């Protein structure tokens, strides 16, 4: 059933890091502006656990300085209030996040010139972070998605090399394994899960921003290209709403995009469905 869930976009960057929280209703094409983040945030990730939206990591970059964030903040859509949570062990700009068993996993990202391979897990019930096994590769501008209680970390930049590699985290055994590499080097891609596939959309290959999109089928263990987006974009937001992928904003090599495109896997087609109220990159996005 369609029950009225919305796409939330938190933070982002346009001329400086932003504090916006806005919700898009794909059913009627409307945008609603919600309570601002207390502190502006770009390069963060969003997720939802237990009906709450979490904004994880990122950076505040403006004429008042450039500082990476270890923050975790929680937004309750029922109260339209943000609440601070326990911070992570380290700041993580251009972080990846995924949720397994009601816990938030934060992977990679950067703190100054440090490119993390470390990974930590947040338990909402105890408002506590705990370090788990590190990735095999340092990854900033990494994308993450979860399928059947496995977490995939895809692409990024290791401090020297921009990556086509990907790896999978097995939470019960607390270990990582490299999986098949992508066709394309991508940092700052949008990574999500839809059906049995992990998608990597857009990103930066070291030369250009990308409009290509590829997906990893966890059964056949292959990466296959699907239809490209209309707009090249890196530092895009991505999420899944009612069985379709939505990509929000990003940087195309010239402009900070307000474009939102929607992918239907049944027709293998992208369409532009709306525009954000202002163009931005580096947003955190989730659905509830």
UniProtKB/Swiss-Prot annotation:
Non-enzymatic covalent modifications of reactive cysteines by electrophile metabolites inactivate the BCR(KEAP1) complex. Accumulation of fumarate promotes the formation of cysteine S-succination (S-(2-succinyl)cysteine), leading to inactivate the BCR(KEAP1) complex and promote NFE2L2/NRF2 nuclear accumulation and activation. Nitric oxide-dependent 8-Nitro-cGMP formation promotes cysteine guanylation (S-cGMP-cysteine), leading to NFE2L2/NRF2 nuclear accumulation and activation. Changing residue 157 to A: Abolishes repression of NFE2L2/NRF2-dependent gene expression. Broadly expressed, with highest levels in skeletal muscle. Changing residue 29 to S: In a NSCLC cell line. The modification S-cGMP-cysteine is found at residue 113. Changing residue 115 to A: Loss of interaction with NFE2L2/NRF2. Abolishes repression of NFE2L2/NRF2-dependent gene expression. Does not affect interaction with SQSTM1/p62. The record marks 113 as: Sensor for electrophilic agents. It is found in: Cytoplasm; Nucleus. It comes from the Eukaryota. Kelch repeats lie at residues 6-51, 52-102, 103-149, 150-196, 197-243, 244-288. Belongs to the KEAP1 family. Component of the BCR(KEAP1) E3 ubiquitin ligase complex, at least composed of 2 molecules of CUL3, 2 molecules of KEAP1, and RBX1. Interacts with NFE2L2/NRF2; the interaction is direct. Forms a ternary complex with NFE2L2/NRF2 and PGAM5. Interacts with (phosphorylated) SQSTM1/p62; the interaction is direct and inactivates the BCR(KEAP1) complex by sequestering it in inclusion bodies, promoting its degradation. Interacts with NFE2L1. Interacts with BPTF and PTMA. Interacts with MAP1LC3B. Interacts indirectly with ENC1. Interacts with SESN1 and SESN2. Interacts with HSP90AA1 and HSP90AB1. (Microbial infection) Interacts with ebolavirus protein VP24; this interaction activates transcription factor NFE2L2/NRF2 by blocking its interaction with KEAP1. KEAP1 contains reactive cysteine residues that act as sensors for endogenously produced and exogenously encountered small molecules, which react with sulfhydryl groups and modify the cysteine sensors, leading to impair ability of the BCR(KEAP1) complex to ubiquitinate target proteins. The Kelch repeats mediate interaction with NFE2L2/NRF2, BPTF and PGAM5. Substrate-specific adapter of a BCR (BTB-CUL3-RBX1) E3 ubiquitin ligase complex that regulates the response to oxidative stress by targeting NFE2L2/NRF2 for ubiquitination. KEAP1 acts as a key sensor of oxidative and electrophilic stress: in normal conditions, the BCR(KEAP1) complex mediates ubiquitination and degradation of NFE2L2/NRF2, a transcription factor regulating expression of many cytoprotective genes. This is Kelch-like ECH-associated protein 1. It comes from Homo sapiens (Human). The lineage of its organism: Eukaryota, Metazoa, Chordata, Craniata, Vertebrata. The gene is KEAP1.
